[PDB]
Write an enzyme that holds these catalytic residues in place. Sequence first.
Site, PDB file in Angstrom:
ATOM      1  N   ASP A 190       0.873  -1.196   0.000  1.00 30.01           N
ATOM      2  CA  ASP A 190       0.000   0.000   0.000  1.00 30.01           C
ATOM      3  C   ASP A 190       0.919   1.258   0.000  1.00 30.01           C
ATOM      4  OD1 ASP A 190      -2.568  -1.207  -0.344  1.00 30.01           O
ATOM      5  OD2 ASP A 190      -3.184  -1.012   1.801  1.00 30.01           O
ATOM      6  N   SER A 220       3.518   1.047 -13.391  1.00 30.44           N
ATOM      7  CA  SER A 220       3.510   0.635 -14.786  1.00 30.44           C
ATOM      8  C   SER A 220       4.847   0.949 -15.451  1.00 30.44           C
ATOM      9  CB  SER A 220       2.393   1.371 -15.539  1.00 30.44           C
ATOM     10  OG  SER A 220       1.129   0.882 -15.106  1.00 30.44           O
TER      11      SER A 220
END
Length: 283
Positions: A180, A221
Amino acid sequence: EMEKEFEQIDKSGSWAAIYQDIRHEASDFPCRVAKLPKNKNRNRYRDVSPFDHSRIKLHQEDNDYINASLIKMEEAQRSYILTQGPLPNTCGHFWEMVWEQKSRGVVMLNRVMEKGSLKCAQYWPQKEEKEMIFEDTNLKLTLISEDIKSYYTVRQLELENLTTQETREILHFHYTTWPDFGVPESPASFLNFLFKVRESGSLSPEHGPVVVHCSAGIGRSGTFCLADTCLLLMDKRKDPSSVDIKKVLLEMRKFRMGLIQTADQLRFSYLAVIEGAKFIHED
Ligand SMILES: Cc1ccc2nc(C(F)(F)F)cc(N3CCNCC3)c2c1
Ligand SMILES: Cc1ccc2nc(C(F)(F)F)cc(N3CCNCC3)c2c1
């Protein structure tokens, strides 16, 4: 070499300084289409947009806009589509893009919920018997099977174009254990996940580009495509110590803004490339 630079940067605590440098030096190109008033509800974040020159265009006109970019790496001979996590109103557009671009794989690097906040829509079916229909783009999506492991999940999906009744198999590679806060302590599972995607053939030239996302489609990404490319380049070239990870990241930033969002993510990318090169009660 890379091992020894990493050693110096760690010792000097210079990750943040190097990261600010990358940001200062990055490309800037216009994003006029992303900023049109009618496209406001197609963007998850107002400060993350695709450049006009490299944006993916949908073929179902009326509105061709999706927050997605084609990253075309010339020396490495690999392409990727980087996109944001779909919104409740853009899941149909997402699958339309996968269909039109002839992608075989989708790489997901986040969980739908993190820290009690929604980061991505539930854009794929969780049960075999409860398929999804996207009425706006005339597509059906069915879960065929899945292989759930401790660090990631691989799903077999069937995507059907209802206009033509053509079907295609899509592989969903979902990394389910990114923290997280911060980055993974070790890049070992990230590396095993990359190898799985490579070994599927989803990255090969015979297919359209792999679709890669996280929530904004630039941080995690970015780490995936940056590490894949540099490892491709370590293999192609005669001295792998020729590969300049900063230079590679600046080249990718010509096609989408913001790629690698933190100093912590830049250190992890280095870490993942150093380790992957070797294969080629507190609570
Ligand atoms: C023999 C071999 C050749 C290339 C490889 N490439 C990777 C990589 F991370 F996909 F680059 C990971 C690899 N391994 C897969 C097995 N466990 C550790 C990571 C790998 C192994
Ligand atoms: C020995 C050392 C030296 C410098 C470091 N810098 C960072 C930073 F966040 F990238 F700035 C993270 C660092 N890591 C992040 C992952 N956990 C260990 C600390 C780090 C570690």
